[PDB]
Amino acid sequence: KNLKYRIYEEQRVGSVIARLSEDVADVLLKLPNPSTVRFRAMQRGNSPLLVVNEDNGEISIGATIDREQLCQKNLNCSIEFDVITLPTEHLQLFHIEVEVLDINDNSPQFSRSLIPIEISESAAVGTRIPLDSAFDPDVGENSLHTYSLSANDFFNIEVRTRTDGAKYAELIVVRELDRELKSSYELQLTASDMGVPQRSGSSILKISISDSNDNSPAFEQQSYIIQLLENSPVGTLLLDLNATDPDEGANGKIVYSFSSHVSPKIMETFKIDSERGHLTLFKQVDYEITKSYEIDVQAQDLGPNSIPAHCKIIIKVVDVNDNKPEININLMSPGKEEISYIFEGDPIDTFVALVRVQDKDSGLNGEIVCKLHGHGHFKLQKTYENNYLILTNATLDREKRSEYSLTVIAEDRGTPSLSTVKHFTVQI
């Protein structure tokens, strides 16, 4: 005869499932000498989960019944057990089937306690990252049901089911990440089943935010006015530029250089340190040639898709008194630097020489005072700016002196003052 029974797993050893006397009365009481029958179980002596009492026919749990090690994740679980009546003469055969129900004696569990995941700050709102699945060997209501993520402002989870039915958690970036502000997170993922009592397991996700090159260098200020004495030595520090980049590694490492469009002249006279940004002089400047310079400097990081920053540096040169006045004396005489005077006297206010002075410099450094200091009484008459005339101031005397020596002094209004002197003689 066939008998079917229904138990819960892990019940205490020795508990009775059924009593043959009570359930197979129709068979036992119809044998010869009903009270003399004895029972024998048909199993091996290794791990007998069900046992029969040979004297009264009690079917009781012999060893622990773990549904999980027995049927794994199958919904249907049942143990088979054959019992026979002794003696052999007209023995009966009882095939006993015990359906095993599952209790919730297993909590959700994670493979690893630390779940390291790396996310680039570039990751767009909506990015999804499947997380480790917890394992719950139970079945039905007792198996893994849902997940939950510790409260925070940047991540969520959606619970999903894959092809085979199992459930898993998908991490979702819901707010724009920024490594420059918060580089790492630590959040708790909790899996829980739907059993009674409800069980839970948990793991910690260590989210690390990798840097992307979402920031370019920045200058303190964009414009600069530098004054430079035209006599500064090669190597003078014109300006130490400082730019900053919040990014990490190469993305935040800055290189300074002259903008790609700078004129060659600027590169001829100035040099910029690629690493520290020391704008230095390479060959001296001359106010008498170019009075100003408009340098365009750029700073760019060594990261990908890099946008550069730029600042403008105006170098204004200032004049120094590095040019001495020039004296030119011109005469009517076609040949030489000598002024010919009539042997026998001459009239007053007679043209002797034209005098022109000039100074390369500017301002007071280029303004000239001219003085005539010959050994006599000639007069230096102004005609226009920096152009004077040399004339006489009284009637001369041939007999007294024949050779004259005149000296012109040109002295600019600079400090230190500079001056030159020229000499020429008057033959009469």
Ligand X SMILES: *[C@@H]1O[C@H](CO)[C@@H](O)[C@H](O[C@@H]2O[C@@H](C)[C@@H](O)[C@@H](O)[C@@H]2O)[C@H]1NC(C)=O
Ligand Y SMILES: *[C@@H]1O[C@H](CO[C@@H]2O[C@@H](C)[C@@H](O)[C@@H](O)[C@@H]2O)[C@@H](O[C@@H]2O[C@H](CO)[C@@H](O[C@@H]3O[C@H](CO[C@H]4O[C@H](CO)[C@@H](O)[C@H](O)[C@@H]4O)[C@@H](O)[C@H](O[C@H]4O[C@H](CO)[C@@H](O)[C@H](O)[C@@H]4O)[C@@H]3O)[C@H](O)[C@H]2NC(C)=O)[C@H](O)[C@H]1NC(C)=O
Ligand Z SMILES: *[C@@H]1O[C@H](CO[C@@H]2O[C@@H](C)[C@@H](O)[C@@H](O)[C@@H]2O)[C@@H](O[C@@H]2O[C@H](CO)[C@@H](O)[C@H](O)[C@H]2NC(C)=O)[C@H](O)[C@H]1NC(C)=O
Ligand U SMILES: *[C@@H]1O[C@H](CO)[C@@H](O)[C@H](O)[C@H]1NC(C)=O
Ligand V SMILES: *[C@@H]1O[C@H](CO[C@@H]2O[C@@H](C)[C@@H](O)[C@@H](O)[C@@H]2O)[C@@H](O[C@@H]2O[C@H](CO)[C@@H](O[C@@H]3O[C@H](CO)[C@@H](O)[C@H](O)[C@@H]3O)[C@H](O)[C@H]2NC(C)=O)[C@H](O)[C@H]1NC(C)=O
Using CB under 6 A, list all residues that contact ligand X: 377, 379, 393
| Smallest distance, ligand V to C-beta of residue 11, A | 52
Q: What distance lies between CA 265 and its chain's CA centroid?
A: 35
Q: Which of 230, 236, 245 is nearest to 279 (CA)?
A: 236
| Smallest distance, a copy of itself to C-beta of residue 37, A | 13
Q: Is the peptide bond before 416 cis (omega within 30 degrees of 0)?
A: yes
Q: Strand pairing partners for 5? A: 98
- The answer to whether residues 361 and 319 touch, using CB atoms and an 8 Å cutoff, is yes
| Smallest distance, a copy of itself to C-beta of residue 173, A | 12
Taking CB under 8 A as the criterion, the residue among 302, 354, 420, 422 binding a copy of itself is 354
Q: Where are the beta strands (DSSP E) in 121-242?
A: 128-130, 144-149, 155-161, 167-173, 184-193, 200-210, 218-219, 223-229, 237-240
| Smallest distance, a copy of itself to C-beta of residue 169, A | 9
Question: Is the Cβ of residue 72 or residue 383 nearer to ligand X in the bound state?
Answer: 383
Sheet holding 114-120, edge to edge: 114-120, 200-210, 184-193, 144-149
Q: What distance lies between CA 341 and its chain's CA centroid?
A: 87
Q: Which of 300, 234, 307 is nearest to 269 (CA)?
A: 234
- CA dist., res. 114 & res. 245, Å (int): 33
Tokens at 107, concatenated: 């909590």
What phi and psi values does residue 55 have, to the nearest 5 degrees?
A: -95, -40
Q: Strand pairing partners for 4? A: 97
Q: Does 242 bind Na ion (CB under 5 A)?
A: yes
86 binds, among Ca ion, ligand Y, a copy of itself, none (CB under 5 to 8 A by kind): a copy of itself
- CA dist., res. 239 & res. 293, Å (int): 14
Report which secondary-structure segment, H or E, holds 267. helix 264-269
Question: Is the Cβ of residue 81 or residue 424 nearer to ligand Z in the bound state?
Answer: 81
| Smallest distance, Ca ion to C-beta of residue 65, A | 8
- The answer to whether residues 108 and 83 touch, using CB atoms and an 8 Å cutoff, is no
CB atoms within 10 A of CB 30: 10
Q: What distance lies between CA 87 and its chain's CA centroid?
A: 89
Q: Does 286 bind Ca ion (CB under 5 A)?
A: yes
Q: Which of 234, 369, 363, 386 is nearest to 287 (CA)?
A: 363
Q: Does 97 bind ligand Y (CB under 6 A)?
A: no
Question: Is the Cβ of residue 292 or residue 405 nearer to a copy of itself in the bound state?
Answer: 292
Question: Is the Cβ of residue 109 or residue 362 nearer to ligand Z in the bound state?
Answer: 362
- The answer to whether residues 117 and 140 touch, using CB atoms and an 8 Å cutoff, is no
Instruction: List the x/- string, 25-64, binding to ligand Z by CB under 6 A.
Output: ----------------------------------------
Chain positions 367 to 386 lying near a copy of itself, rule: CB under 8 A, are 383-384
Taking CB under 6 A as the criterion, the residue among 99, 176, 240, 294 binding ligand Z is 99
Question: Is the Cβ of residue 236 or residue 242 nearer to ligand Y in the bound state?
Answer: 242
Candidates 175-183, 273-281, 406-414, 418-426 — which segment interacts with Na ion by CB under 5 A? 273-281
412 binds, among Ca ion, ligand U, Na ion, none (CB under 5 to 8 A by kind): Ca ion
Question: Mapping DSSP to helix (H, G, I), strand (E, B) and coil, where does residue 38 land?
Answer: strand
Which residue of this chain has its Cβ atom nearest to ligand Z in the complex?
Answer: 76
Instruction: List the x/- string, 66-105, binding to ligand U by CB under 6 A.
Output: ---------xx-----------------------------
Chain positions 360 to 379 lying near ligand U, rule: CB under 6 A, are 379
Q: Does 393 bind ligand U (CB under 6 A)?
A: yes
Tokens at 148, concatenated: 């939950």
- The answer to whether residues 49 and 60 touch, using CB atoms and an 8 Å cutoff, is no
Question: Is the Cβ of residue 58 or residue 247 nearer to Ca ion in the bound state?
Answer: 247
* Type of residue found at 142: N
Taking CB under 8 A as the criterion, the residue among 260, 336, 403, 415 binding a copy of itself is 260
Q: Which residues bind a copy of itself (CB under 8 A)?
A: 40, 42, 44, 82, 84, 86, 88-89, 91, 93, 95, 111, 117, 120, 122, 129-133, 162-164, 168, 212-213, 259-261, 263-264, 292, 294, 296, 303-306, 314, 328, 330, 332, 342, 350-351, 354, 356, 383-384, 387, 389
Q: Which residues bind ligand U (CB under 6 A)?
A: 75-76, 379, 393
Q: Which residues bind ligand Z (CB under 6 A)?
A: 76, 78, 99
Q: Which residues bind Na ion (CB under 5 A)?
A: 240, 242, 276-277
